[PDB]
Design a protein around this ligand. Structure first.
Ligand SMILES: NC(=O)C1=CN([C@@H]2O[C@H](COP(=O)(O)OP(=O)(O)OC[C@H]3O[C@@H](n4cnc5c(N)ncnc54)[C@H](OP(=O)(O)O)[C@@H]3O)[C@@H](O)[C@H]2O)C=CC1
Ligand SMILES: [Zn+2]
Lengths: 134, 94, 125, 83, 342, 207, 114
């Protein structure tokens, strides 16, 4: 096990459904011997023979620019296009739908308060569920 | 409320007793931790419930300028009893 | 007479601070967001300059929050963004800017609460 | 050794990227039908110089600035990448 | 791993390391540097003391609030040692004397007290134990101190394995009993040396080096069943070393030979003293046996300290002994000592 | 008649505005933005080339015998590019009135010294240098006063942290008072206190 | 761009003063090793002098160099005289402060900082 950090504990990008990249700012430092995640990966690499080229966070942002430069553009939605090609390209394949309905899993508010690890570990979410189911 | 823990230390009204593996018990060697015996939970629970006539009343601490700011408590419920915020005095009406 | 210094203005050797809090430190220039518990907007209207937070730990004696960095509570106040950019470039710090956020102007009407056709017909008062 | 990922970078409005957009709308479906298991990532931004990256077996990447390049020249550089 | 022994901070005062340590010879000469190097990075240091509180004041500092806990003890009385190691991770034995007393002999300093301390450490459940023997510690040696120290080094393994046994040479420092001891031979108008100092080799070490070594060994995942030879560089021949001492201390130098039996009798009648003696038979014996070539063992550089030459730190020790007319003299005016390898 | 609020005068306001016109029209080459506060205080603002002539003028003129220096200060304002707003507080003793003279500076735009006018300004200029870093030309000594000897920094700047960058304690290894990097057993709890409601519309900075 | 000078037309006229200052420090060090009973060698003192000079060798603005010359002349005043002590003089050497690592992995092993 390699303890990482949380969104309250690392400057990090998280792209939304729109595509807007958004930078977290570190509030509290992670506890114990827990560290940032890319930091752990680069340390692993240096213990191996790889030794990834970057040492700091801005270098990682340069790498993100090299891969996908929609990410450094914080709070900057960018107009995408080229849906007609995907239409032409999906019209080819022949996978058929089922004659079976589709219920979402979050069917009621009872299933909203617990969706991930953090919400699973929560006295308040559990109190809310205890109140919703009763 | 001065129950002890299996380690042997005293416990405060804030359940605080150092764990058996905590190195910060050294400071209590040839020494002692100051912990108060008179708990406020027990001592405010060892008080009666003040029957009153009205449905709204006023609670100062009891000395006027020596108590707390004058607040007002409703007593319409009968499932429970009113309770001051500053002090913990309880009230009811018949 | 005058002097032809075209290169960037630099002051780091004069402030007498160490290299760590010049190169390692990152700055955030921003207009502080409104506290949503209040509808007041005067704690906005000025730009600021914070530093990246660092490790805070508990002193084993009492539990006090300790620090090893002195720029924990460093907060400055500027009236424009150009001035803060200038100050950060001048003191050798690397910055990251948050452009201004203004609320949209909205068409408010009290008579829309009593509509005949629309769904703005509120049912309480 | 072998090719694993291509990815293209461009703009929607800077004319130095034109020839890449035309190349996309002309040849992308053909290229994907030719290479249905390969991924090739098209990511467009506001104001950047176009590029073309080629991700080989290890972390081995190769750039070529195809700025102000007609679509035929784009396709030629791309076939040079593929071969 | 308890949450309170997790290291935090930038490695300094007002920080945390997880190095809760009982240091038993803390009121001495090496222990003060050990406690200083521990408090300098943030670490609780339990310090058992039998002396008067006047002689623990210099240790009252060198640590942030609550990180220095003193409690009184007695080697005769067990339950004054379990009480100390009850909450610790590390234990560092520095106990030692350069003379016997009516109450405590060398056996009852180097053998029976480490055995008790290590028994208490194993029963309490601590992780480490740093014992400090001597480089020349050998069961077939000439001195009661050295044989007792080898016996203790063996019995500590027999009781508490997973231990660390450091074997320094004769240490020098500001308030040592090595350079000051050779420099106080000016009050006698000539210095005696067995065989005029030749056929004797000394490889001294500095206090800071041993202290940093101990303070890293209490954090190194290595050094669990390893002995060490804290020797330092520049093996020296005794005549040239005393000549360097009496040049840096610019007084004079009148050497002359002396046998070992009469110098032993001198040490004996000097050790006839209720106070701290100036000389003893075991001290003469320990002075006039050479230091082992230590290259069969790791040393400092296998632990994270680059050893310090005597020539760079000796003036700090020896300027105390100078007079006026020489006190304002520098390090580079003493034609340094002649080194040997042998 | 209003007991809670302060009583206001008229004659002092008129007097000091007239004297501001006087100084303005008599010393135009150096003067900027003469002003008179609500409370009766005159405040002249000066180009740094005008320090010695303005101070000598107010010291030695007959209608302006400002021959006693009360303070020489500075105010670090990182917003304006010329940060340090250097101030001179002077009194007359012939007319029983005070005046304020101001000029600006930067880390690399020093100012003429004033010891040729008021000898009081020696230690005050040394203090401004020690605290803000404003060099002063043709000053006799111009060394620190208040800070430690081997001190790196100009404290009363706003860009300097309150707790400093170094910390002291005595080490037995070296037998000295060594300077170590700052590390607090308790971080200074900064508080955000400015209410988000305009209390003073008269000073309403418009957008 | 068209700014005022202080004690300097441009960089060579300032490097002149810089070398004068290095000269004064080099001549002064052996007197301070003697007056205040320092326990170091004259070589490492002058090495510290050259080090604290090279800490500012990356700069080009003449005004910065002039203010640095001024600060160094102040320090040289305090050091020629014995206003300051063995403490403030040995405060340059960092004889207690453990060396701040410059490797990634040690930083990762102790601390969250870069
Ligand atoms: N030149 C040197 O110093 C060298 C030392 N060593 C080893 O280093 C270790 C420490 O050296 P050093 O620091 O000089 O020793 P010190 O004599 O300087 O101080 C040793 C400590 O031992 C304690 N002590 C001694 N006898 C007893 C006793 N009978 N009961 C309880 N406590 C006792 C003293 O406590 P108090 O003073 O309060 O009684 C003192 O604090 C020793 O183990 C020694 O073998 C090895 C080589 C060189
Ligand atoms: Zn009440």
């Amino acid at each position: 096990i390699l303890p990482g950090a949380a969104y309250t504990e690392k400057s990090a990008t998280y792209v939304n459904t729109e595509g807007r990249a958004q930078q977290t700012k570190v509030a509290v430092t992670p506890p114990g011997l827990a560290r940032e995640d890319w930091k752990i990966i680069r340390a692993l690499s240096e213990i191996a023979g790889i030794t990834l080229p970057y040492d700091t966070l801005d270098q990682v942002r340069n790498r993100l620019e090299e891969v996908s430069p929609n990410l450094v553009r914080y709070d900057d939605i960018e107009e995408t296009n080229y849906f007609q090609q995907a239409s032409e390209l999906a019209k080819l394949v022949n996978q058929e739908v089922l004659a079976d309905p589709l219920v979402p899993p979050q069917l009621t508010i009872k299933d909203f308060y617990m969706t991930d690890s953090i919400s699973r570990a929560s006295q308040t979410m559990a109190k809310c569920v205890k109140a919703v189911t009763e | 409320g001065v129950q002890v823990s299996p380690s042997g230390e005293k416990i405060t009204h804030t359940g605080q007793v150092y764990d058996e593996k905590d190195y910060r018990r050294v400071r209590f060697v040839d020494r002692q931790k100051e912990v108060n015996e008179n708990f406020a939970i027990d001592l405010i629970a060892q008080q009666p419930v003040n029957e009153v006539e009205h449905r709204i009343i006023a609670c100062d601490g009891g000395g006027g300028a020596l108590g707390h700011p004058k607040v007002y408590i409703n007593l319409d419920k009968e499932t429970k009893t009113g309770t001051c915020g500053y002090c913990g005095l309880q009230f009811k009406q018949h | 007479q005058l002097i032809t210094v075209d290169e960037k203005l630099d002051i780091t050797t004069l402030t007498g601070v160490p290299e760590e809090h010049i190169k390692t430190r990152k700055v955030r220039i921003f207009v502080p967001a409104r506290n949503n518990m209040q509808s007041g907007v005067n704690n906005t209207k000025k730009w600021k300059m914070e530093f990246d937070t660092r490790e805070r730990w508990e002193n084993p004696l009492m539990g006090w929050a300790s620090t090893a960095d002195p720029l924990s509570n460093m907060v400055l106040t500027f009236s424009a963004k150009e001035d803060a950019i200038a100050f950060a470039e001048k003191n050798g710090w690397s910055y990251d800017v948050e452009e201004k956020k203004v609320p949209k102007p909205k068409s408010k009407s009290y008579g829309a609460n009593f509509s005949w056709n629309k769904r703005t017909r509120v049912s309480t008062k | 050794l072998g090719l694993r990922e291509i990815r293209v970078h461009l703009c929607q409005r800077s004319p130095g990227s034109q020839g890449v957009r035309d190349f996309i709308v002309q040849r992308y479906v053909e290229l994907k039908k030719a290479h249905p298991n390969l991924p090739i990532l098209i990511r467009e931004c506001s104001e950047v110089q176009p590029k073309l990256w080629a991700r080989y077996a290890f972390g081995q990447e190769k750039t070529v600035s195809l700025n102000n390049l007609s679509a035929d020249e784009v396709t030629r550089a791309m076939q040079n990448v593929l071969s | 791993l308890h949450h309170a022994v997790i290291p935090h901070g930038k490695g300094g005062r007002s920080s945390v390391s997880g190095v809760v340590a009982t240091v038993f010879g803390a009121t001495g000469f090496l222990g003060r540097y050990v406690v200083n190097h521990l408090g300098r990075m943030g670490s609780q240091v339990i310090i058992p003391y039998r002396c008067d509180v006047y002689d623990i004041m210099h240790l009252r500092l060198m640590g942030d609030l609550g990180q220095l806990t003193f409690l009184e003890w007695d080697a005769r009385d067990k339950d004054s040692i379990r009480k100390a190691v009850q909450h610790s991770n590390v234990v560092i034995n520095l106990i030692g004397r350069e003379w016997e007393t009516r109450n405590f002999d060398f056996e009852d300093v180097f053998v029976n007290i480490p055995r008790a301390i290590a028994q208490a450490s194993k029963e309490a459940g601590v992780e480490r134990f740093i014992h400090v023997s001597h480089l020349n510690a050998s069961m077939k040696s000439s001195s009661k101190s050295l044989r007792s120290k080898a016996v203790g080094e063996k019995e500590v393994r027999s009781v508490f394995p997973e231990a660390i046994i450091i074997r320094p040479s004769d240490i020098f420092g500001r308030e040592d009993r090595f350079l000051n001891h050779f420099a106080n031979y000016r009050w006698f108008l000539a210095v005696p040396l067995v065989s005029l100092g030749f056929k004797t080799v000394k490889q001294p070490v500095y206090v800071a080096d041993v202290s940093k070594g101990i303070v890293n060994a209490t954090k190194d995942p290595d050094a669990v069943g390893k002995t060490f030879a804290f020797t330092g560089p520049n093996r020296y021949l005794l005549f040239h070393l005393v000549k360097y001492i009496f040049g840096m201390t610019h007084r004079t130098f009148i050497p002359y030979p002396l046998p070992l039996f009469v110098y032993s009798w001198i040490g004996k009648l000097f050790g006839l003293s209720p106070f701290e003696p100036w000389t003893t038979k075991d001290k003469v014996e320990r002075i006039h046996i050479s230091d082992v070539m230590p290259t069969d063992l790791p040393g400092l550089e296998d632990l994270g300290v680059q050893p310090t030459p005597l020539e760079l730190k000796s003036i700090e020790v020896l300027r105390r002994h100078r007079t006026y007319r020489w006190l304002s003299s520098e390090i580079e005016e003493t034609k340094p000592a002649k080194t040997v390898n042998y | 008649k209003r007991p809670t609020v302060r009583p206001r005068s008229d004659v002092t306001h008129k007097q000091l505005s007239a004297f501001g016109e006087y100084v303005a029209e008599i010393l135009p080459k150096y003067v900027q933005q003469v002003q008179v506060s609500c409370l009766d205080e005159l405040e002249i603002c000066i180009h740094p080339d005008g320090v010695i002539p303005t101070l000598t003028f107010l010291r030695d003129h007959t209608n302006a015998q400002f021959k006693s220096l009360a303070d020489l200060t500075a105010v670090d304002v990182p917003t304006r590019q010329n940060r340090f707003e250097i101030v001179y507080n002077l009194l007359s003793l012939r007319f029983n009135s005070r005046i304020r003279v101001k000029t600006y500076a930067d880390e690399l735009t020093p100012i003429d010294s004033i010891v040729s006018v008021h000898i009081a300004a020696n230690w005050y200029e040394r203090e401004v240098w020690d605290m803000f870093g404003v060099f002063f030309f043709n000053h006799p000594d111009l060394r620190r006063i208040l800070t430690d000897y081997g001190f790196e920094g100009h404290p009363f700047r706003k860009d300097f942290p309150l707790t400093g960058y170094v910390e002291l304690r005595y080490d037995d290894e070296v037998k000295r008072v060594v300077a170590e990097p700052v590390e607090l057993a308790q971080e200074f709890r900064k508080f955000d206190l400015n209410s988000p409601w305009e209390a003073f519309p008269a000073y309403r900075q418009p957008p | 761009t068209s700014v005022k000078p202080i004690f300097s037309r441009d960089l060579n006229e300032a490097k002149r003063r810089v070398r004068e200052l290095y000269r004064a420090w080099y001549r002064e060090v052996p007197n301070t090793v003697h007056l205040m009973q320092l326990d170091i060698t004259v070589k490492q003192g002058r090495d510290k002098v050259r080090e604290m000079f090279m800490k500012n060798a990356h700069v080009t603005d003449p005004r910065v160099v002039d203010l640095l010359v001024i600060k160094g002349k102040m320090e040289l005043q305090e050091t020629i005289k014995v206003w300051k002590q063995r403490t403030h003089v040995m405060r340059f050497f960092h004889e207690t402060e453990t060396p701040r690592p410059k490797d990634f992995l040690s930083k990762f092993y102790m601390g969250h900082d870069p």
